[PDB]
Design an enzyme around this catalytic site. Structure first.
Site, short mmCIF file in Angstrom:
data_model
loop_
_atom_site.label_atom_id
_atom_site.label_comp_id
_atom_site.label_asym_id
_atom_site.label_seq_id
_atom_site.Cartn_x
_atom_site.Cartn_y
_atom_site.Cartn_z
N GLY A 21 -7.25 -7.66 10.38
CA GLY A 21 -8.25 -6.67 10.73
C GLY A 21 -9.36 -7.34 11.52
N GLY A 49 -9.00 -5.44 1.02
CA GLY A 49 -9.20 -6.76 0.46
C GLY A 49 -8.01 -7.21 -0.37
N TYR A 108 7.21 -2.04 11.73
CA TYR A 108 5.95 -2.71 11.37
C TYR A 108 4.75 -1.77 11.45
CZ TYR A 108 1.86 -5.73 11.34
OH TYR A 108 0.62 -6.27 11.05
N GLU A 118 0.80 -1.21 0.00
CA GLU A 118 0.00 0.00 0.00
C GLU A 118 0.83 1.26 0.00
OE1 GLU A 118 -3.55 -0.42 2.48
OE2 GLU A 118 -3.35 1.69 3.08
N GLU A 126 -8.64 -15.80 12.57
CA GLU A 126 -7.71 -14.68 12.41
C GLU A 126 -6.27 -15.14 12.60
OE1 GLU A 126 -10.98 -12.26 11.48
OE2 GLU A 126 -8.85 -12.23 10.94
N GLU A 173 -16.35 -1.57 4.43
CA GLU A 173 -15.11 -1.10 5.05
C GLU A 173 -14.32 -0.23 4.11
OE1 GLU A 173 -16.31 -2.80 8.37
OE2 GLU A 173 -14.70 -1.30 8.23
N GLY A 227 -0.43 -9.30 10.85
CA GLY A 227 -1.66 -9.07 11.57
C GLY A 227 -2.92 -9.37 10.80
N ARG A 266 4.30 -7.08 5.35
CA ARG A 266 4.99 -8.13 4.58
C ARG A 266 6.51 -7.85 4.58
N1 LIG Z 1 -8.85 -3.29 7.41
C1 LIG Z 1 -7.99 -3.87 6.94
C2 LIG Z 1 -6.88 -4.60 6.38
C3 LIG Z 1 -6.88 -4.96 5.03
C4 LIG Z 1 -5.79 -5.64 4.50
C5 LIG Z 1 -4.70 -5.95 5.31
C6 LIG Z 1 -4.70 -5.61 6.66
C7 LIG Z 1 -3.54 -5.91 7.51
C8 LIG Z 1 -3.28 -5.68 8.82
C9 LIG Z 1 -2.02 -6.23 9.10
C10 LIG Z 1 -1.56 -6.76 7.94
C11 LIG Z 1 -0.27 -7.40 7.69
O1 LIG Z 1 0.40 -7.59 8.72
O2 LIG Z 1 0.07 -7.69 6.53
O3 LIG Z 1 -2.48 -6.58 6.93
C12 LIG Z 1 -5.79 -4.92 7.19
#
Ligand SMILES: N#Cc1cccc(-c2ccc(C(=O)O)o2)c1
Length: 429
Positions: A401, A256, A365, A238, A411, A277, A399, A385
């Site tokens: 969500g 997503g 992180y 992102e 989760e 969301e 993590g 990542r």
């Molecule tokens: N809301 C939300 C959302 C959507 C996509 C990814 C994540 C998220 C939180 C933590 C991580 C990760 O650790 O890669 O990815 C959280």
């Protein structure tokens, strides 16, 4: 600025990681390699380092450390120090901790003393690697000779990876998710991202692991660094913020076989929970960007589209605006940091819940890796990542969500899936 043609049949990511590994090792210098829009920039050697901590700002140059007290916004303290760096060099690089984003919610008192907020340096040399060429900036004779010696040989073979066990839960992620679910059910907040560290029981070769992981992924941005005793690499899913010299500000929040991938794409575009969301997140990005933008300039230019990143497909939107003359790139970063993907909804409540229900400080992180330019540019990639090494300890972090309907076992398996981005591509040192 000098140029070398890119050798044919050589992948830029491989060559840039090899330069980062071999050239910086021969002179024993720190570095940061940043991939951005087909360009890999290797920032080699520390000309000057800006260390922003919760209680102090330091500028370290040529063995001399200047210490400063700072008050107010961390972005203003960081921006003033980094603008001074950019008066002498064209670009500055570094990382921003998750903890940099807690001040906007009045939560900085919850930070232990000496909590790192940001590390930004001006490099001694820059090497830009792309499909077309290798460009050298402020490269001295010793560095130019090292680069030519590396180029006269083929890139190293990436050895077979070593597996890591991620099935254990020593930090009680399952238990901490159950607490978050109860808090959400009581109406405290709507969503929070909780995570877990996974210890790697062996030393990782960071540039070789970087190469192996980059073969399978085409991320938004990527990085590989060795800076101030920290080794890190990652494939950013992102873009937190991009600020251009012309004033355009962008933020791209996400939310997503061939037949199996097409079916997954159809679900990504029709999932009601993901759509709700995403709409809330896009509305949050728009409200935030409006505080630093010229009135009437904030808009959604790509709304809910799929972006393919090689081994991962994401649903996302692009929020654009023009930076107000009364604002700056650090205020734009502060307005959009931390990401909803790194925190939760409402963001203030999610950040507060992370102090109590996650291992803190998070550090790199869910923070960002950044590239700044003298013309006013900013590029900040969300750090997820990623793999880290600090003083004898090597670890991964992932993590999920958490919402009212979340289940701890589900989760935990979801962090296992996100960890799969790096776990089969870990090269042992
Ligand atoms: N809301 C939300 C959302 C959507 C996509 C990814 C994540 C998220 C939180 C933590 C991580 C990760 O650790 O890669 O990815 C959280």
């Amino acid at each position: 600025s000098s140029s070398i043609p890119m050798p044919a049949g050589v992948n830029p990511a491989d060559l840039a990681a090899e330069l980062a590994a071999v050239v910086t090792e021969s002179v024993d210098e720190d570095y940061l390699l940043y991939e951005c829009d087909g360009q890999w920039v290797l920032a080699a050697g520390v000309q000057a380092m800006v260390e922003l901590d919760s209680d102090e700002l330091r500028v370290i140059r040529d063995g001399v450390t200047r210490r400063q007290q700072w008050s107010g916004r961390p972005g203003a303290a960081l921006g003033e120090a980094v603008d001074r760096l950019l008066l002498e060099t064209d670009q500055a690089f570094g990382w921003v901790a998750f903890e940099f984003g807690v001040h906007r919610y009045g939560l900085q008192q919850r930070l232990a003393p000496h909590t790192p907020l940001a590390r930004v340096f001006s490099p001694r040399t820059r090497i830009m690697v792309s499909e077309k060429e290798i460009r050298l900036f402020d490269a001295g004779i010793r560095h130019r000779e090292a680069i030519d010696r590396l180029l006269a040989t083929g890139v190293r073979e990436v050895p077979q990876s070593r597996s890591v066990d991620v099935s254990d839960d020593p930090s009680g992620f399952r238990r901490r998710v159950a607490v978050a679910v109860d808090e959400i059910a009581a109406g405290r907040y709507h969503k929070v991202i909780l995570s877990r560290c996974v210890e790697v029981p062996f030393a990782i070769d960071f540039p070789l692991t970087y190469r192996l992981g980059r073969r399978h992924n085409t991320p938004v941005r990527s990085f590989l660094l060795q800076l101030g005793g920290i080794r890190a690499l990652g494939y950013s899913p992102e873009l937190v913020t991009a600020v251009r010299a012309d004033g355009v500000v962008i933020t791209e929040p996400l939310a997503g076989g061939p037949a199996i991938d097409r079916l997954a794409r159809d679900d990504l575009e029709s999932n009601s929970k993901e759509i709700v969301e995403h709409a809330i997140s896009v509305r949050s990005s728009l409200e935030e960007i409006t505080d630093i933008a010229e009135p009437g300039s904030a808009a959604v230019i790509d709304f809910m589209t799929v972006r393919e990143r090689g081994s991962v497909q994401h649903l996302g939107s692009t929020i654009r605006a023009r930076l107000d003359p009364s604002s700056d790139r650090m205020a734009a970063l502060e307005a959009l940091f931390p990401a909803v993907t790194a925190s939760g909804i409402p963001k203030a409540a999610g950040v507060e819940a992370i102090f109590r229900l996650d291992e803190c400080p998070r550090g790199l992180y869910s923070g960002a890796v950044v590239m700044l330019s003298a013309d006013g540019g900013l590029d900040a990639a969300l750090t997820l990542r990623a793999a880290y090494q600090v003083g004898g300890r090597t670890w991964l972090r992932a993590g999920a969500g958490i919402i009212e309907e979340s289940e701890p076992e589900r989760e935990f398996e979801e962090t296992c899936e996100k960890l799969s981005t790096l776990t089969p591509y870990l090269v042992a040192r």
